[PDB]
Design a protein around this ligand. Structure first.
Ligand SMILES: *[C@@H](C)[C@H]1/C(=C/c2[nH]c(/C=C3N=C(/C=C4\NC(=O)C(CC)=C4C)C(C)=C\3CCC(=O)O)c(CCC(=O)O)c2C)NC(=O)[C@@H]1C
Ligand SMILES: *[C@H](C)[C@H]1/C(=C/c2[nH]c(/C=C3N=C(/C=C4\NC(=O)C(CC)=C4C)C(C)=C\3CCC(=O)O)c(CCC(=O)O)c2C)NC(=O)[C@@H]1C
Ligand SMILES: *[C@H](C)[C@H]1/C(=C/c2[nH]c(/C=C3N=C(/C=C4\NC(=O)C(CC)=C4C)C(C)=C\3CCC(=O)O)c(CCC(=O)O)c2C)NC(=O)[C@@H]1C
Ligand SMILES: *[C@H](C)[C@H]1/C(=C/c2[nH]c(/C=C3N=C(/C=C4\NC(=O)C(CC)=C4C)C(C)=C\3CCC(=O)O)c(CCC(=O)O)c2C)NC(=O)[C@@H]1C
Ligand SMILES: *[C@H](C)[C@H]1/C(=C/c2[nH]c(/C=C3N=C(/C=C4\NC(=O)C(CC)=C4C)C(C)=C\3CCC(=O)O)c(CCC(=O)O)c2C)NC(=O)[C@@H]1C
Ligand SMILES: *[C@H](C)[C@H]1/C(=C/c2[nH]c(/C=C3N=C(/C=C4\NC(=O)C(CC)=C4C)C(C)=C\3CCC(=O)O)c(CCC(=O)O)c2C)NC(=O)[C@@H]1C
Ligand SMILES: *[C@H](C)[C@H]1/C(=C/c2[nH]c(/C=C3N=C(/C=C4\NC(=O)C(CC)=C4C)C(C)=C\3CCC(=O)O)c(CCC(=O)O)c2C)NC(=O)[C@@H]1C
Ligand SMILES: *[C@H](C)[C@H]1/C(=C/c2[nH]c(/C=C3N=C(/C=C4\NC(=O)C(CC)=C4C)C(C)=C\3CCC(=O)O)c(CCC(=O)O)c2C)NC(=O)[C@@H]1C
Ligand SMILES: CCC1=C(C)/C(=C/C2=NC(=C\c3[nH]c(/C=C4\NC(=O)C(C)=C4CC)c(C)c3CCC(=O)O)/C(CCC(=O)O)=C2C)NC1=O
Ligand SMILES: [Cl-]
Lengths: 67, 167, 593, 156, 161, 156, 161, 159
């Protein structure tokens, strides 16, 4: 299935992480196509600066066979 | 659901339009809304004092709760009980703004007895402290100048009635 | 008044000892404790000599310790109650120091002391820390300070003073995730008392064994157990993509969810709603908060399948807020975050490892039926309602497939029963009566078919009562009582039965109707518990309802049932509930005018 | 239906249908032709049976709500008479009065008391309808229909 | 319970009319199958125990269900199975003579799957046994009346299933 | 078992077991050694009591489906005799006829009538096994086994 | 009502053989623990009311579960709690004497959790009362019979928890 | 909850210092703790061999491993083995704690409902756990085997 290689840093603005709830924000992550719209919207909702979006798997203009 | 949305939903489920009894009740709620917002403001300004002093008065009248047998003995349980007091005060203030106990129905009485029986929390000191909170908000509302203390009487009584047992 | 979500047995941890913390760690890693955890336990049990004797000497000299314990306050100005609480607090602090010394952990001190700065009136905090320092000095004064465990007592007193000097620590907040989700607050004392849960974070540069530990914890979160030892966890492409620099823990959680292993475990044996609840456990670490959350999930599954539900759970705001990108989901229970009362019963039955043992979806039933009136149910739950067949005491087992909906009925509450009298007619219900159907023999047989819903074997015949009734020595009522006091009746309806279930089924066989409420059921249960089986049989036969309905010469017959009984007795539906619409016209087929 | 009475009689005492129940069954399944003919005749002349019953009913007892001038009340009365003689046809076909009972004469009294129509007026109208059923049917068919008309008469 | 005349009457009554022509020839079909239905009921009533004997001998005997650990071990369990078969055959006779499967709905197949699953009575073997009973009754009543009673037996099997 | 009868007798009157019931319990747990000995002896010689029972049961009443030439029916008869002597051993260990009744002698009549084997020939075969149980067991043990064999004779 | 004898017979009977040597060792164990089980049951019968008095004294009194608004308030509820405690004592004794807890499993623990959740009876509190009863019987009997009956007391708690 | 937690819970519920009998109970726990730990280590190093021997002596060549049994269908066998490992390791947890609370909170609650829903024989489970008690006894020694068979018997009590 066609994948997105996405690097983004999503900051927290509504919670203070005490010592363990802190995880990371600068993630590079392979994203499936059918979820990337919702992941882009989610990390835009939380307030993340998306610095790098490329097509990891699949080609451009695929009429079929892309999944 | 506040009074408005509850009454509207009832008439929706029976299919009637608004009759004059509903218009009178809605106008009554809209007139009482100034007092309701005033009480919400005083509550938001003195909530920590009200909840904590009600806990203190309850532990004075019910002495056993801070004694070692009681389920508010240590400061962990003491802080948990005072946080429950803040919970009751906050959702009773929500119901005071709304004028309806739906908020209490879905967010206070949705399993409170099950939790308090699972943890061994005594029900009747909880409702006694709820009544101390109600008398406290009643008296500083009367000092504030609100003659009608009927509105602030109802959410604490509803929580007490739904939580308490049957003697 | 409202239906019950269940009050499960909960053990809230007030602190941690040394053995409890080590066993908690080993348990939360799903392994035997290892050599360093072994050294933890064995070294603490080695110091147990010194710890127990420290507690011995402190408890022995406690009176003088608190007698010895800035501007010193006046007794008369402070108050008698406040002086009493000062002395009580001081003895309490010393007791908790000895508790910590024996337990080997200052978790009890730190949990119970850290947020005490303003609980104590905070104008006497200088007096409080001076008194605690003087207790430290005295406790060390009669416990020789050269190189002994007086260093330990100094450290524990120092930890107590350091916890007490910590000012207002912020309560933890479980913020509401939607308009239907209530936000919750959480004291830090309750957070620090709660059992430590490992936070398995997978970074791309971790060693292999740490990565495999994170994989195993991902299996334990999602598949509820370690599947890596089995060859079913052959997911070499997802694991391999996860280990190196790509395919992070969120993508791996999604790949675990959409795998056919997860479908075989938590989607194939379940209906959609129970599957949604289990997915909520396995991908967010918590159960359904509210009904509207379940509406969202159920509609989404209905138009897009369960894999899209997994995609939506792991793609949600709450998932990235708690578990982010590379943190394994963890179960969010009692001390981990603040708990809601709304889903207390279902979520504590869901976090338990026996959550797949329940098939009927616990969250939706509780959430929906709280917003509904009381159900038609036996007062001691639905397991006490037998199956309305001709014979056989068929009750729902509490353990085999628990489909339990607990409900509190009042003492005066009465069950609505569907009577056969108002229904049907007469000469339609007087065919099932069998008074004095005039032959004696038929009346013996019908009294059997009431007492035991089918005709019984010869060894179960009460032939002496047959001879008595054929001779006219006893009437029909006494014969029915003798059949209900026969041994085979006791075996059929009293021995292999829960006692209130036994009482209810004997009431249904001897009265022809279910009980109404806690009046009747309470009286029968009290009778059969303080007096026994034959006493209940005699009290049911001599019950006024038996005399009003069945008199003395009439065999008992079924008169009332539960509405579920008629729903069983109409599998094609009820007769005429609204006029049918045979040959209707719908839009589209009409529009092609 | 009489088949249902035979089965519930064979049932409720846990036994197969006795030879005598089968004998009544063969008698009924051979009288079914006459029952079908009676029902067809009743369905054919229902309208005029109701009109003539209303004629005799309004002649003999005119102090009823049906002839108080309101056309809707007498439309309801016309339809009630038609429904009752339809139930008579149903009980004719079924061989027993159970259709008549379970459809029209179980809670009949409280029904008409809620509708405030006096019981004896309904009984008078049913006597009229019984006479109309006599006048349009042969003697055997008149007896078969009049048994169920008497069943209604008892029920009021 | 309901029969063929009763359910035709009730559908027509729900529509608010008399027996229409289609229900009329359905009632003629009933009124001309009645004599063979009564004779088939009489022949079943003459040989009920023999039918259960052949049924158990051909479907349940000489299996693990009758050996130790099986459902028909411990003789009173065998008797309970035999009495359940008597019930199935008697109520199939009731549904055949009635002409409707209603009596099976209100007195046999209600809660029966729940009852058998509660007792551990295997339901697939019970379906096999009821269809064996169908073969036994098809054997010596003939095809036609055997087909008529096997319809209600298959309804029993569907209700168990 | 005798214990289960003592508990169920203590039950159904909502009272703790009497001194008499517990006295019977002490006597029984003393006799348990002899009862285990009887069970071991029966389990040791099951094969030969079944063989000799078949021998004399065919020598007395040959008009049975057993010796009708089908060796499968002989195997079934041998297995039934073995199961019933095993049930007697179970009653010996339990000290009550509860294993004999609950597994063996509640549905005797429906089972063997469905099986078409006539009842009293099984009664004869059980007399035959009773005489063999006399022939191989000591007198107290023989009487203890004889109680349950007579219970079997009552059952058929 | 199943006991250690009847459980042994039923596992031997489901397989279809006689009781084997290890089962006979278990049978000997029951046959030689019978005397102390009877002596313990006689002592429990003599002192059951004293047990329940002591049990409620050390576990259920002087907590606000007993004061107003408790589950032990409204004196019929106190009598109900005492009557339930008597039933747990009697049925733990019945399970102890017979050797297996089948009477507990079939008479008490099947649906008592649903009943106590329906009445609002605090389940953790009644578990605490059962183990207080276990400790009381431990105190007035000794170790051996004490642990033998505390086995089934802990079984009651497991059926509750 | 270990033995220390239950002891301090009683003492704090009655609101006193640790009493001499309570200190004596802690003494028995603390100075039997070294043999408890040693038993824990060798139970950790030999858990697989114990489970093997216990299935061999209690659960093999009965008709529950045969067709139609509960340990037919190899995945059910692996589930059976894993249940035995869970019972061994949680009895070890309780042995190190000195209290049966980890059993009551993580094993015995949830187990009877699961086994009765899945159709698992309770009797075969208890005979397997008692075989485990015998095997650990044989490979450990009478005292350590008795101290861990107390918790194995608690698990059998909850079944
Ligand atoms: C004083 C009020 C009494 C008291 C309280 C007490 N409560 C707990 C624990 C909890 N309380 C709650 C309550 C709520 N959750 C909700 O969602 C709502 C509505 C907003 C309420 C009221 C819950 C869920 C818990 C569990 C822990 C948690 O914080 O999530 C305790 C601690 C229990 C323990 O022993 O650990 C206490 C002490 N105790 C008394 O004695 C007073 C009568
Ligand atoms: C339609 C024929 C009748 C009807 C339906 C109705 N259902 C609901 C709500 C729900 N229905 C379900 C059902 C299922 N859960 C499953 O897992 C499966 C899949 C096999 C089914 C069929 C559930 C869980 C709900 C709740 C979630 C949801 O609302 O979507 C409603 C709404 C009830 C409410 O209060 O909103 C309705 C109306 N109602 C009728 O009158 C028809 C006869
Ligand atoms: C026989 C073909 C199969 C079989 C049967 C079997 N049944 C039982 C026990 C019961 N059977 C019933 C059934 C009914 N109750 C009703 O009212 C009706 C009609 C709706 C039926 C059919 C009931 C209630 C019981 C329990 C009480 C009783 O025995 O009377 C058993 C005994 C099982 C046990 O443990 O008691 C058995 C063996 N078993 C087979 O193997 C056949 C496939
Ligand atoms: C021998 C003493 C008599 C005899 C025996 C005979 N029996 C059968 C067949 C069966 N016997 C049984 C018996 C039982 N089932 C149980 O659960 C119990 C345990 C308490 C018993 C005793 C059964 C069920 C059968 C059927 C086969 C099976 O087990 O599946 C036969 C053969 C009948 C045939 O042809 O099917 C025979 C011959 N016959 C005599 O004449 C002796 C008096
Ligand atoms: C005083 C008139 C008599 C007396 C009293 C006495 N009572 C107790 C202990 C208890 N009494 C109660 C009472 C009630 N609970 C109810 O629900 C009702 C009705 C509302 C009543 C009256 C309770 C609950 C207890 C238990 C203790 C507790 O509250 O936890 C004692 C103490 C006995 C002991 O050892 O606990 C005493 C002494 N004594 C007399 O001499 C008078 C005749
Ligand atoms: C006592 C230790 C605890 C307690 C008990 C309590 N229980 C009830 C009421 C009932 N208890 C039962 C129990 C059983 N049913 C059975 O068949 C068996 C025997 C095997 C048992 C144990 C039942 C059925 C009832 C209901 C009786 C009724 O309908 O009145 C109550 C009273 C409930 C009420 O509100 O009246 C109480 C108080 N409560 C505690 O706090 C103790 C921890
Ligand atoms: C033969 C190719 C190899 C071999 C075999 C061997 N097997 C056993 C014992 C058992 N085998 C099983 C197998 C299964 N049970 C199932 O349910 C399934 C699914 C169909 C399987 C495959 C079991 C459970 C046992 C235990 C016995 C029992 O049934 O209770 C043994 C004996 C081992 C022992 O220690 O006794 C042996 C020898 N041995 C070889 O050398 C071959 C490679
Ligand atoms: C084996 C000796 C016995 C046996 C076992 C058996 N168990 C299952 C299935 C499960 N067992 C559990 C139990 C637990 N899981 C845990 O994490 C814990 C410890 C905290 C326990 C106690 C669970 C939850 C299951 C469900 C599925 C799973 O495999 O995890 C099976 C399979 C049952 C089935 O049909 O799926 C078996 C065979 N069965 C016997 O007959 C032995 C006596
Ligand atoms: C570590 C054990 C522990 C302690 C000591 C503790 C503290 C505590 N004392 C408390 C309170 C006080 N301590 C004190 C007194 C002291 N506490 C001290 O240690 C000293 C030396 C002083 C100053 C003289 C006072 C005046 C109060 C007022 C209580 C009230 O507000 O009504 C409370 C509140 C509950 C109660 O009234 O019982 C708590 C929770 N809670 C714990 O868990
Ligand atoms: Cl330390």
């Amino acid at each position: 299935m066609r994948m997105f290689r996405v690097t983004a840093c999503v900051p927290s603005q509504t919670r203070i992480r005490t010592q363990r709830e802190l995880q990371n924000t600068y993630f590079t992550k392979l994203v499936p196509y059918d979820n990337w719209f919702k992941e882009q919207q989610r990390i835009q909702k939380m307030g993340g600066t998306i610095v790098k979006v490329e097509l990891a798997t699949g080609r451009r203009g695929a009429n079929t066979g892309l999944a | 659901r506040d009074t408005v949305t509850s009454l509207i939903s009832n008439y929706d489920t029976t299919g009637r339009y608004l009759d004059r009894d509903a218009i009178d009740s809605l106008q009554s709620y809209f007139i009482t809304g100034a007092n309701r917002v005033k009480v919400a403001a005083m509550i938001s300004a003195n909530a920590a004092e009200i909840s904590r002093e009600a806990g203190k008065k309850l532990f004075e009248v019910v002495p056993e709760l801070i004694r070692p047998g009681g389920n508010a003995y240590t400061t962990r349980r003491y802080a948990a009980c005072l946080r429950d007091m803040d919970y009751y005060l906050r959702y009773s203030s929500y119901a005071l703004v709304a004028g309806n106990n739906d908020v209490l129905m879905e967010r206070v009485l949705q399993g409170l007895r099950e939790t308090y029986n699972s943890l061994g929390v005594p029900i009747a000191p909880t409702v006694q402290g709820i009544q101390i909170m109600k008398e406290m908000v009643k008296e500083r509302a009367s000092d504030m100048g609100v003659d009608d203390t009927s509105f602030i009487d109802q959410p604490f009584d509803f929580i007490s009635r739904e939580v308490s047992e049957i003697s | 008044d409202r239906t019950n979500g269940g009050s499960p047995v909960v053990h809230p941890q007030q602190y941690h000892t040394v053995p409890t913390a080590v066993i908690n760690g080993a348990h939360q890693r799903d392994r035997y404790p290892n050599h360093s955890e072994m050294q933890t336990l064995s070294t603490f049990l080695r110091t147990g000599l010194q710890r127990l004797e420290i507690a011995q000497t402190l408890a022995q000299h406690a009176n003088e310790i608190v007698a010895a314990g800035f501007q010193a306050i006046n007794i008369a100005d402070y108050g008698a109650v406040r002086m009493k609480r000062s002395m009580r607090d001081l003895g309490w602090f010393l007791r908790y120091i000895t508790y910590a010394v024996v337990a080997g952990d200052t978790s009890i001190i730190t949990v119970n002391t850290r947020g005490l700065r303003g609980i104590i009136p905070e104008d006497v905090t200088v007096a409080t820390t001076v008194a605690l320092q003087e207790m430290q000095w005295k406790s060390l004064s009669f416990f020789p300070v050269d190189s002994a465990a007086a260093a330990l007592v100094r450290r524990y007193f120092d930890v107590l003073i350091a916890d007490y000097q910590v000012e207002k620590p912020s309560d933890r907040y479980r913020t509401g995730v939607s308009k239907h989700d209530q936000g919750l607050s959480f004291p830090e004392s309750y957070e620090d008392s709660g059992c430590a849960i490992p936070r398995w974070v997978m970074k791309p540069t971790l060693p292999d064994s740490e990565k495999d530990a994170v994989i195993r914890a991902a299996y334990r979160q999602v598949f509820e157990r370690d599947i890596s030892g089995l060859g079913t966890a052959e997911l070499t492409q997802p694991i391999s993509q996860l280990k190196g620099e790509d395919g992070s823990m969120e993508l791996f959680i999604r790949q675990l969810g959409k795998s056919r292993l997860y479908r075989q475990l938590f989607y194939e044996p379940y209906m959609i709603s129970r599957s949604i609840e289990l997915a909520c456990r396995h991908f967010l670490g918590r159960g359904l908060s509210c009904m509207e959350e379940f509406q969202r999930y159920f509609e989404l599954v209905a138009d897009q399948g369960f894999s899209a539900l997994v995609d939506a759970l792991v793609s949600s705001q709450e998932y990235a807020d708690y578990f982010g990108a590379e943190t394994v989901p963890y179960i969010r229970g009692l001390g981990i975050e603040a708990q809601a009362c709304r889903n207390w019963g279902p979520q504590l039955d869901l976090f338990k490892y026996s959550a797949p043992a329940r098939k009927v979806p616990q969250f939706v039933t509780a959430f929906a039926s709280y917003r509904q009136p009381l159900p038609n149910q036996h007062p001691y739950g639905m397991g006490n309602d037998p199956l309305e067949t001709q014979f056989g005491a068929i009750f729902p087992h509490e353990t085999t497939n628990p489909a339990a909906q607990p409900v509190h009925f009042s003492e005066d509450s009465r069950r609505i029963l569907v009577g056969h009298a108002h229904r049907k007619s007469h000469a339609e219900i007087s065919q099932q009566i069998f008074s004095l159907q005039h032959s004696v023999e038929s009346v013996i047989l019908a009294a059997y078919r009431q007492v035991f819903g089918c005709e019984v074997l010869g060894s179960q015949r009460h032939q002496a009562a047959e001879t008595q009734l054929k001779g006219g020595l006893i009437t029909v009522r006494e014969f029915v009582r003798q059949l209900a006091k026969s041994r085979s009746f006791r075996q059929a309806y009293w021995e292999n039965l829960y006692m209130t279930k036994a009482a209810e089924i004997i009431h249904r066989r001897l009265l022809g109707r279910p009980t109404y409420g806690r009046r009747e059921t309470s009286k029968y249960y009290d009778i059969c518990g303080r007096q026994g089986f034959y006493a209940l049989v005699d009290a049911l036969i001599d019950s006024d309802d038996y005399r009003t309905a069945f008199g003395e010469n009439t065999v008992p017959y079924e008169r009332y049932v539960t509405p579920r009984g008629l729903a069983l007795r109409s599998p094609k539906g009820p007769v005429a509930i609204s006029k049918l619409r045979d040959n209707p016209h719908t839009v589209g087929e009409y529009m092609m005018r | 239906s009489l088949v249902t009475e035979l089965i519930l009689s064979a049932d409720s005492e846990a036994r197969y249908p006795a030879p005598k129940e089968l004998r009544i069954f063969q008698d009924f399944v051979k009288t079914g032709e006459q029952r079908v003919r009676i029902a067809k005749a009743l369905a054919a002349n229902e309208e005029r049976i109701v009109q003539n019953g209303s004629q005799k009913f309004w002649e003999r007892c005119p102090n009823t709500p049906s002839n108080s001038g309101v056309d809707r009340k007498t439309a309801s009365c016309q339809r009630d008479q038609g429904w009752y003689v339809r139930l008579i046809a149903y009980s004719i076909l079924a061989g027993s009065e159970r259709p008549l009972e379970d459809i029209g004469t179980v809670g009949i009294k409280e029904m008409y008391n809620n509708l405030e129509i006096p019981i004896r007026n309904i009984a008078e109208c049913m006597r009229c309808l019984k006479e109309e059923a006599m006048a349009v049917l042969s003697d055997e068919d008149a007896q078969e229909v009049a048994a169920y008309f008497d069943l209604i008469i008892q029920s009021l | 319970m309901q029969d063929a005349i009763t359910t035709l009457i009730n559908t027509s009554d729900a529509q608010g009319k008399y027996l229409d022509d289609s229900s009329l020839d359905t009632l003629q079909e009933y009124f001309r199958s009645g004599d063979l239905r009564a004779k088939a009921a009489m022949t079943i009533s003459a040989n009920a125990s023999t039918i259960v004997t052949k049924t158990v001998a051909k479907s349940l005997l000489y299996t693990d269900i009758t050996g130790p650990g099986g459902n028909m071990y411990t003789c009173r369990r065998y008797a309970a199975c035999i009495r359940d078969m008597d019930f199935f055959l008697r109520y199939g006779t009731y549904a055949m003579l009635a002409g409707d499967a209603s009596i099976l709905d209100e007195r046999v197949l209600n809660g029966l799957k729940e009852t058998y699953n509660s007792l551990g009575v295997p339901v697939g073997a019970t379906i096999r046994a009821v269809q064996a009973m169908k073969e036994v009754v098809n054997d010596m009543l003939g095809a036609e009346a055997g087909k008529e009673v096997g319809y209600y037996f298959d309804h029993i099997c569907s209700g168990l299933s």
